[PDB]
Amino acid sequence: DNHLSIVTLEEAPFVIVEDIDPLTETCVRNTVPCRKFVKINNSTNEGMNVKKCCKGFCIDILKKLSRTVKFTYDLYLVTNGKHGKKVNNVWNGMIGEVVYQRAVMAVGSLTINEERSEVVDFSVPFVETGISVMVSRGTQVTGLSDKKFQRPHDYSPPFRFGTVPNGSTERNIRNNYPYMHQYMTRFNQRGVEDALVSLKTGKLDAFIYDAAVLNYKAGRDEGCKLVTIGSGYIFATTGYGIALQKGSPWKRQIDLALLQFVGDGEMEELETLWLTGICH
Amino acid sequence: RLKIVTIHQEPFVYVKPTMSDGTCKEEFTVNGDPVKKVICTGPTVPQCCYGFCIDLLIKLARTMNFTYEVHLVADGKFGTQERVNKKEWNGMMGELLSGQADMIVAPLTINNERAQYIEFSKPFKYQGLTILVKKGTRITGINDPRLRNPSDKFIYATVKQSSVDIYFRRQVELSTMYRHMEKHNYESAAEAIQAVRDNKLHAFIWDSAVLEFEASQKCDLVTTGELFFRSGFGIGMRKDSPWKQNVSLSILKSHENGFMEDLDKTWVRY
Numbered sequence A: 001d002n003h004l005s006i007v008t009l010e011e012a013p014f015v016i017v018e019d020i021d022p023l024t025e026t027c028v029r030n031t032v033p034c035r036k037f038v039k040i041n042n043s044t045n046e047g048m049n050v051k052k053c054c055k056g057f058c059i060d061i062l063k064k065l066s067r068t069v070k071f072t073y074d075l076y077l078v079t080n081g082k083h084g085k086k087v088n089n090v091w092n093g094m095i096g097e098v099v100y101q102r103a104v105m106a107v108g109s110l111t112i113n114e115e116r117s118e119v120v121d122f123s124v125p126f127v128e129t130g131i132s133v134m135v136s137r138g139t140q141v142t143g144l145s146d147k148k149f150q151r152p153h154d155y156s157p158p159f160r161f162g163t164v165p166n167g168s169t170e171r172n173i174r175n176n177y178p179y180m181h182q183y184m185t186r187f188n189q190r191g192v193e194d195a196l197v198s199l200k201t202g203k204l205d206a207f208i209y210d211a212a213v214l215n216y217k218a219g220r221d222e223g224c225k226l227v228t229i230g231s232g233y234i235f236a237t238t239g240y241g242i243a244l245q246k247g248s249p250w251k252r253q254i255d256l257a258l259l260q261f262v263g264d265g266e267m268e269e270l271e272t273l274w275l276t277g278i279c280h
Numbered sequence B: 001r002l003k004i005v006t007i008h009q010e011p012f013v014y015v016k017p018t019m020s021d022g023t024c025k026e027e028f029t030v031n032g033d034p035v036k037k038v039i040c041t042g043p044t045v046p047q048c049c050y051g052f053c054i055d056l057l058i059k060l061a062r063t064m065n066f067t068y069e070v071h072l073v074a075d076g077k078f079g080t081q082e083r084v085n086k087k088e089w090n091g092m093m094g095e096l097l098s099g100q101a102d103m104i105v106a107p108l109t110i111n112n113e114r115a116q117y118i119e120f121s122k123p124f125k126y127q128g129l130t131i132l133v134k135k136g137t138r139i140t141g142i143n144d145p146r147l148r149n150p151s152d153k154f155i156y157a158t159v160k161q162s163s164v165d166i167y168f169r170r171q172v173e174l175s176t177m178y179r180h181m182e183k184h185n186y187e188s189a190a191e192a193i194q195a196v197r198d199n200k201l202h203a204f205i206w207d208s209a210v211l212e213f214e215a216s217q218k219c220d221l222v223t224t225g226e227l228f229f230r231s232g233f234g235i236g237m238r239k240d241s242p243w244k245q246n247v248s249l250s251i252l253k254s255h256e257n258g259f260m261e262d263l264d265k266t267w268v269r270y
């Protein structure tokens, strides 16, 4: 049919996961049903499907696509991996659900890159991203390619800057700037929200990460003390897109629909609803 | 042998006279890197072409094992659809669709109207729309009173038969802006920028990737700073083209490679 298995992943404000409304058995308001497979323990593959409710910027996209392209969907959240990483030539995350045909599309904060694009089709990008830099207001940085990151010990004192390891940001820096990568491991942050506090409290001078996430965090930071660089200095510019199975019959109409949403203002309204914050 | 159509649009495509023996002057950037030049025919002698898009074309050619000849679009336009009943695209869009060109390598905006008819690559450049004025002129940006309810006092415009003209023609709440602009649009970006320096035109609404470069080198001119709409440039190919998939894979690889960043350094930033 035109009934589709669709995988997503929790990452506010793009996908926000909530327990089913208390508990009239139904998803209300903003939200759509999404099921999650929850393991009984870590010594087993056994689990139970748990009914949850999903909302957010990407869910609002999914809803508009569903109505325009005319399809229905069963939405579920991915249980092994995050976005998609190739482990020993084998994909986990959302990308894995698509390539192995448990899902025919993937909707979420899924960054378009070359490696993924060899095994899945990607819609046009519907939000811009890349590798950005966040600092406390006052600090002077152009972006990732600044000499101040590339040769840290040409400055005294050297800048304290890092990222969250094991994702695309670390992998990209390792391939392009090997000494930078060697240098900043000592500053690994274990999550976005710890990096923010290390920035606001002076333990870190710069945080390097996904531009779309950093812009969201900066726009809502209490005190408006954290700033990112201008989008002209974003490195490896790309976008979130919707992944489809290779050769999918939905790609052309999903693409035209997203371009219609961008061109006619609807995407802008979604950005104001979910992504724009009180700062700047 | 792919027939590439492009258009004059600094810093993406520079167009300069050949030398006497029909070769291109050898040249280097102030940072010591070769400026790669290709011969390009057009409105009809050979000329030298180079810039951001030319480096992209050269990079794509070596990566995908094809050769090319480059010409400038005849009517000097980007491409909109017009009534003839039949419809037809003018500009580079029309040339791509009639087979006069196999591929558009230009700062060609990706939008829904064009993508109905051709295949775009993933974007090779992300940018937006902004407003160039001559310093002295002062406006809020896109919501300034002089823009939201025009008169002949303050004349603003864009390029005719461009993605920007479509953008204003299609949206019901830009209807008064559009009526003012259609009677004043220009035939090219350069002519519109020259008309801003000469005070015959008071605001030019165009691609930020072009307008910021113009402002940073022509310091009588300034942009507002805002982007009021975001859009990307893509490679244009016909619906069938076997180059579609590998072209966009190469664009993606070049963003992750730092290559596009080097192009941005060399040509786009000041």
Ligand SMILES: N[C@H](Cc1cc(C(=O)O)nn1-c1ccc(Br)cc1)C(=O)O
Pocket: A083, A084, A109, A110, A111, A112, A129, A130, A131, A164, A166, A167, A168, A169, A170, A172, A209, A210, A211, A235, A236, A237, A238
């Ligand atoms: N959307 C996530 C990726 C996102 C999280 C990761 C991270 O955890 O480091 N970094 N990015 C990121 C986004 C764009 C670019 Br270019 C480089 C890194 C994804 O799809 O993997």
